[PDB]
Amino acid sequence: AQSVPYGISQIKAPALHSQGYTGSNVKVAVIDSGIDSSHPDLNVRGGASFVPSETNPYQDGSSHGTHVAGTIAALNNSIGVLGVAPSASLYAVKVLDSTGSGQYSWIINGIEWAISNNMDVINMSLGGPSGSTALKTVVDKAVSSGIVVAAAAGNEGSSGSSSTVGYPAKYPSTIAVGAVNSSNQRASFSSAGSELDVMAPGVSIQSTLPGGTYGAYNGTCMATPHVAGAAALILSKHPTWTNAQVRDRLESTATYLGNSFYYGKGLINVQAAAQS
Template sequence: MKKFLVLITTLFLLMVPLQTSFADEAKTQEKDEYLVQFDGPAKKGLLKAFGVQSQDIVHEFNQLPVYNVTLTEKQAKGLKNNPQIKHVEENAEAQSFAQEAPWGIPHVQGTEAQNNGHTGEGVKVAILDSGVDASHEDLNVAGGYSVFGDSPYNDGNGHGTHVAGTVAALDNNLGVVGVAPDAEVYAVKVLDSSGSGSYAGIAEGIEWAINNDMNVINMSLGGSVSSDVLKEFVDLAYQEGILVVAAAGNSGTWLGWFDTVGYPAKYESAMAVAAIDQSNNRASFSSAGNAVEISAPGVGVLSTVPGNSYDSYDGTSMASPHVAGVAAQVWAAKPNLTNVELRELLNNTAENLGSSFHYGNGLVQSFEAISY
């Protein structure tokens, strides 16, 4: 019996320094943000065992057992080797896919659809971006959320306001009109005033869209590295019936055949949108690859910017909201479609432009899809 007690005491004393080392290191070493996903129910106690304190938890997700936490390199490695942990990855940075200066509305048959009474009424579109200027005279923002804790209705970058205008600028004889002027736009702020954000922020924005019953998510943003956790959130949104639309990226293509599509557009559950000009030529900056699914106007696109102003930008960021707006028009016209059926319809009725590597299924066509 004495030998057994000595053994237990020895094991306990051996365990204490291990846990203390994580706690001590966590106080002194440099930390970075990580996304940690449990392989099963989330257990805060396990995080605590690795020295993670409550102040280290940036965000706790509720749709998946995921935490955005600050960790030292040692903590991250320790968690990664734990059998109860599914993923541990650094919180990668994302950038808006904008370059510079919308003739695009009639080009995607948005005007023809509007003239026949299809304006996207009742369809909820979440704009995951830099916020949307809700005070703009040409926009009607139905709601929103900011991962930064500030107002989603202040757009210090202008990118999100421009994207929102392409989707749903009002038909009010002012400025411009969007593809689906009666769609409900929601400002989900995941990028800061410099147009930067993180994969954790995007995931948090997607989760908000799921929790708030959005129909369409537009993501005119992305990064060059993949993320298992971000993919799971995009997949989850699609599984929950949301149509996910994302800019393919502005990395062009090297020697004409290298795959340059960014993330999250590259995930199978998202529609990757390429950019074309007024002559239906692929924009030189538009990323190419097998994941490109559909094309839309992305050169010299005029839309709303903060301060009741308007400007023209280039980018696949500008192409993506054309597709989101068309999706709103078609879904309002055909409300019984599932998101999978809607996606298939948009692809089947697109105007073929050539190589699928560059254009996907071609130029999205709203009235063609509604009339199909």
Template sequence: MKKSVRLFPHQVEEVVMAISEVPEGLELIQTPYFWEKSKGKGMVVAILDTGCDLEHPDLKDRIIGGRNFTDDDSGRADLFKDYNGHGTHVAGTVAATENGTGVVGVAPEASLLIVKVLDKNGSGTYDSVIQGIQYAVEQRADIISMSLGGPEDMPELHQAIKEAVDQGILVVCAAGNGGDGDPETEELDYPGCYNEVISVGAVDFDRRSSRFSNSNNELDLVAPGEKIRSTYLNGKYATLSGTSMATPHVSGALALLKQYANESFGRQLTEAELYAQLIKRTIPLGYSPRLIGNGLLYLSVDRYLEQLATEKIDGLYVKAE
């Protein structure tokens, strides 16, 4: 099975040495509001990507282990360092620690399992992704986050995802960056368009659907995916765009929701129940579901609904029914 899987095309817009901020994407989805209830403590998010900057000050305390399934570093399984930057950026959006400097992730107390399935060039094989999924299952990850894809529907990959979901693991995937802004056209990348995964498209900070975001009937929701600032190589920070950047917002949000739901319900919720908890925390944006699925991830949807009945929201006046 030598057919390849890859990073979706993405744009590196800026690299800086030092910053100190709560990224704008976290503000858009109302993450700080939800930190009153949960910060993802005890949750393990497996990042299947290009590895990670293991010494980054915002990430080193969150990483609990990992494995390399690529040919980088002569294929040594215990070396899962990032030479590309993409995986480090994704990891920071999920769980950069809250240390008063740099950036903070959606779930700053979650743990990261770094599963390197893409090499320094951002490419890999379906075999490596399948092995990475199986490893994440063996390590009892709560969430698998994949900002990658390919054009081929591979039954073996689909089966590995089904087995992960059967174990109660939430599998989150980027929808892909082959879109043209037209909901009537269909762009499919795998594994993002498998029904079993949570497929994530992108919007900008003005809640406009990103033109590059794939459209299809399998899209579940959207999250910020343009000009996203997060951790990068050599302890730096970078601004990137793509559905790859939207996906970790959802993966981190699921870490928050799973911790909160388990504590609130007094039991482990099923994958289907947690999916329902996620989707109930979305808001409509006025676009076709083929572009945005159920809507924009919005962790304070209860406050949104209260406002909806009485006042304007972000400049949009609505009529109370």
């Protein structure tokens, strides 16, 4: 039997599903450690690897990309879990190796691939503490091209009044996503700063794992795919909205939870964001 992870319900994705919107025809690039394309609860439509030592983007030695992918678009069926956008078109853009790490050069190549292949949404559940002009340039290029780019805010916790949001979440062109639990409480590891845009569930998030199994992880890495999936739901209902419109609706209709330094605009509400 199929289970719906709490986070899917917490962002009100089922309301869109009931309206008949599940992300159909929206192309979502999972820029991560690959996706186990053999998982029976995933449908991976394409992809590409930019890790020199791992030419196969459809094998995931880390599990990170496969878990992220399941939160975005685990299939609606008789097994496993259910994604935010279970009909979305998933693409495995491998820029991280089996250790779950990668160089910015690999990541940049993945974003370029997403642009060249006309992706609608980019999920980047990754980041580092140091900036990069080349990274900012390609991320801005993706946004100017019309792509919705969601990025994990970071797992560095809080440090007084200083921002701990990492890159590329720190860039204004990306949606920086923090993590809350099922009570809408901020996770203590969730990075904070003026760059934080929204929150999504990121504690004990059940999703798909390589080998056809399932398991729970914590991180802003897990919160980000809720926003990527939400953007895919919004585009399946409003195919003409620009990425700027999609972003504005996700942020402005969020459920305020408190100090924006720690919570941004609050918890995304895709039901309110997608209201005609």
